[PDB]
Amino acid sequence: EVVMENVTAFWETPVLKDINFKIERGQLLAVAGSTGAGKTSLLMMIMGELEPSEGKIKHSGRISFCSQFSWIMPGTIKENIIGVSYDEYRYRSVIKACQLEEDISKFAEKDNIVLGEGGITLSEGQQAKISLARAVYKDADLYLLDSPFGYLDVLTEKEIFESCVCKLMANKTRILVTSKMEHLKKADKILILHEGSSYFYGTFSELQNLQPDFSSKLMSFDQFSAERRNSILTETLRRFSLEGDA
Numbered sequence: 001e002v003v004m005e006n007v008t009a010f011w012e013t014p015v016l017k018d019i020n021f022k023i024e025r026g027q028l029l030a031v032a033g034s035t036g037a038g039k040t041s042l043l044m045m046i047m048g049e050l051e052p053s054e055g056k057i058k059h060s061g062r063i064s065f066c067s068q069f070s071w072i073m074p075g076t077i078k079e080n081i082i083g084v085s086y087d088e089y090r091y092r093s094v095i096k097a098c099q100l101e102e103d104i105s106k107f108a109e110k111d112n113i114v115l116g117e118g119g120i121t122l123s124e125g126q127q128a129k130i131s132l133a134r135a136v137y138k139d140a141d142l143y144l145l146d147s148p149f150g151y152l153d154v155l156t157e158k159e160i161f162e163s164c165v166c167k168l169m170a171n172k173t174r175i176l177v178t179s180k181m182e183h184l185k186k187a188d189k190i191l192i193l194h195e196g197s198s199y200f201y202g203t204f205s206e207l208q209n210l211q212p213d214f215s216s217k218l219m220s221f222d223q224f225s226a227e228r229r230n231s232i233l234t235e236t237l238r239r240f241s242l243e244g245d246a
């Protein structure tokens, strides 16, 4: 469980302001909003790299964080995912749901291929999948997934969101930062951020009803690139003011 009550915070204008939400056990919070809105900072705060200046974060547990920038340790594919604690059944289910089995089978050494300076040189998509695999393999109470689908094509991102984030991780408490509407449509609750504050918290069906013009703007949106979706989100969110647009 994660509880946020009237939370505000600034780094070093506050980065986050008046945040209020409660996520139940085994629920999926999809977070979306404009660039610089505080999305990653929200995660940083759950991880305790950011002290709240007001309000209380009622949380305790082991957290696993997948960052939005992929990274790779020198060592094998298996090692990059497992670290040093190995369970065969867990491992298998994670590489399956993160769609790595095909990638792995294409190598002679399979998941014992060594990566790094003397390494095979992996695609951005592969590295993203391994990074997510590492985060999902870690046994944790809370999964914080910050835009993990970055360099994947539409089908692969889809199969991972469904098999991993929704199916395999069904009983975990997770927060996913995303700009994909389909992911919002599937989440238990969504949170829309802009300039530090929440402009919606609730369900996707609920958002469509309470802010029909806002929703109308974001619906073939998912067929745009990550950059264009974040640009569209940002522009629509900027309309929340007293100013005249364009």
Ligand SMILES: Nc1ncnc2c1ncn2[C@@H]1O[C@H](COP(=O)(O)OP(=O)(O)OP(=O)(O)O)[C@@H](O)[C@H]1O
Pocket (backbone or CB within 6 Å): 011, 012, 015, 033, 034, 035, 036, 037, 038, 039, 040, 041, 042
């Ligand atoms: N570790 C940090 N130390 C100091 N300031 C930070 C830190 N991380 C983020 N910020 C600042 O906080 C603001 C919000 O950044 P944040 O990464 O939380 O937004 P975001 O919504 O995740 O952005 P994006 O979606 O474009 O990656 C930015 O203006 C940034 O400069």
Ligand SMILES: [Mg+2]
Pocket (backbone or CB within 6 Å): 039, 040, 041, 068
């Ligand atoms: Mg971010």
